Amino acid sequence: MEKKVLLTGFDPFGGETVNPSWEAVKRLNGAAEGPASIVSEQVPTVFYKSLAVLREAIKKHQPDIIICVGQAGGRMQITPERVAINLNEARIPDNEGNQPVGEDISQGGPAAYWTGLPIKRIVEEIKKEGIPAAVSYTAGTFVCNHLFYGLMDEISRHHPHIRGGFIHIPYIPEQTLQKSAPSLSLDHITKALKIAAVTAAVHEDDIETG
Amino acid sequence: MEKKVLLTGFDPFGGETVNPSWEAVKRLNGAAEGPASIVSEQVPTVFYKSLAVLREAIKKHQPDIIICVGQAGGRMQITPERVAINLNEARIPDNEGNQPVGEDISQGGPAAYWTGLPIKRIVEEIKKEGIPAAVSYTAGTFVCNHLFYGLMDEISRHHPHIRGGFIHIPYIPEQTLQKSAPSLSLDHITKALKIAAVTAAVHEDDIETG
Amino acid sequence: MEKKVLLTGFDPFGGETVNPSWEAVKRLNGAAEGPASIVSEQVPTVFYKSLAVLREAIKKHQPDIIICVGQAGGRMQITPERVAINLNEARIPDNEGNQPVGEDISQGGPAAYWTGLPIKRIVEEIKKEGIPAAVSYTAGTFVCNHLFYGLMDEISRHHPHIRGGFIHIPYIPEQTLQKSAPSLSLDHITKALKIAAVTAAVHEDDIETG
Amino acid sequence: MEKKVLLTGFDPFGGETVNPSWEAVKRLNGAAEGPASIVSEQVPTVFYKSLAVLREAIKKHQPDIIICVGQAGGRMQITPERVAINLNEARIPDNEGNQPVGEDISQGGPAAYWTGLPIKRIVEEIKKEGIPAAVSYTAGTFVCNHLFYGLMDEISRHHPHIRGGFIHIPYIPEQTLQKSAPSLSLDHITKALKIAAVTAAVHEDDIETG
């Protein structure tokens, strides 16, 4: 059996020198685990450009499953996102100075898109391996929600066979040295991400525990 | 232009014999402030029945503006909600024992509805009076989001002239006596609610700030 | 039966415009409640000078009870302090630029002083009136702990008949407008402070609970 | 020159079968790193008995440096403690049912004891290795503070040559699976602890920071 799984992580931004989402997905590049064969691409933390880079990664890799990963500084758990919202509302500018306020991602697109990943199943499997996980119901209104909405929009309109979604991850310890915030080690985050890609490759559907 | 503004607050939800959302909106019943003439109705913290009670309050009062209020224990600010989600996913049972998991509120309805209130404007006005306010992007998946989504569905399909939305409020101090959690006094919360009703009755368009 | 209660509050620091500890104790100046007769003085948020101002307030008013109040931004409850510590360790400079690091308050003084107030009784009485309260075991190492330690030192060495202590209070709502943080209204804080002064004037002895 | 460092950790408490402070120090037993030669002993989470077990470990091992470790569920950083307080005030009963309230540890002992470890130095060295650390000024009033005060009392009165202190550690991920709380991995915590032992074995002098 073989499902091709595209993982994306973002580049560094807003002060930081490392984006853990890219550090964790980069080491899974080329991994084969169960049915999953994993490839990893980096997306810029830039509005509009991130979506162009993702469309290119879909053309080049022809994936069956796409999991985009971003950092959510301050959370304590790996959180798969249930909902992408059609809004760009930037509190801070992106890496190229764009700061959209009140802007639609898709003019006339739906208000929201649900995730296509079996996220409750992913949460229970990550937890079986001893690492904290929970589903989140807001992915923010910055570049991470932008890429999630843009991904689901592309799937619905042009690649309906693809199962796609977004997972937010904590800070790693090295990033909370001058500011106390929760974190999870990079080893637990890359392990959780591998479990997510394999669970999404094996399972079509989700379980009803909530 | 006098605008009738319907305000609702939930009945005590198993945990106390008082619900602050009701206590606050009940004292604004009959208040007239600027163009706003305010009426208040209580809604049960029960899935499906809450919506039936709301439909009845809409028929009886014929409101121009509807602001539904509920309690969000743990928050620190008055938070107007930007997005209602088509999902009933109950961690705990409602007042009559219903605990829906993974259920659509409207089968075939949109995934989400945006608020119809000028919420950025409301946030800035509450803050001008010295009380903390912020827009929130998830209203949960319990009876409070249920009523919010049901409200906006009713408006979209049957009462397109009505401006409607949802505002979550914190605990009052009396509720954090055995469990430390943030709170706002009931006098600040009812004041914030009266400012929201007046701001919504005086302006159809929102500010762009965030 | 009449006890003179001296309350003090600090002026503002950091970048705030009101120090709620002064705003609250100022409105209790001249209040008589039960046995207590209350007078209020303001102390500067300056190391070493705060202590000189307090010594002067003790000479002038000849109090039976002294309760020094300061703001603890970020807490959620009124917190009477159990322990003062012999250390000035300033993360930020005070209002006149002093920033002591690793400095003894009293060279050769004890490492700590316990409060002289019936703080468990005070906590239970404030909570009986519906406002959250709890004892704290660190008052920090800035000017608020400095005044507390210096107060207890003054009492132990020169005024052993006086009952003295420190009470930290939260932000008021008006201070959490740009930064979300917990707060208590100024009406709840001044009412908690009047209850603390009256409870301390009526009982020399504390209850034993937590 | 070799310094024998004794580390302690506690036994299981509260429905758990493993205690991280003990899991982390147990794997350092017999380690030699720089000048430090480390031995580890387990202490019961029992008032009064913990102190007797510690006195026995001091007699048997004759250590130059003692670092007692306990878990502080909820914190986000490794926190060396600056102050031990002379008070047993138990919110919950210990492993054998003792629940002291308002009790002195040493009748007539000082109100507090300062740590004997170079804790600022320890904090900067742990952070150099990418793991979060900060000094704490309250170690609670349960069995962890009890052992810290009792240790410093023993040192002051009978073993003035020993350098001793206490370090609180976070939850590990496995413990925050049903309750979301911050954690650090057991590998990061045991690495922090070995760095603490070696920094204390090499430096009697502490540094001056903020």
Swiss-Prot record, chains A, B, C, D:
Keyword Nucleotidyltransferase recorded: no
Subcellular location: Cytoplasm
Any one annotated GO CC term: cytosol
Keyword Cytoplasm: yes
EC top class, as a word: hydrolase
Main location: cytoplasm
Stated family: Belongs to the peptidase C15 family.
Name by which UniProt lists this protein: Pyrrolidone-carboxylate peptidase
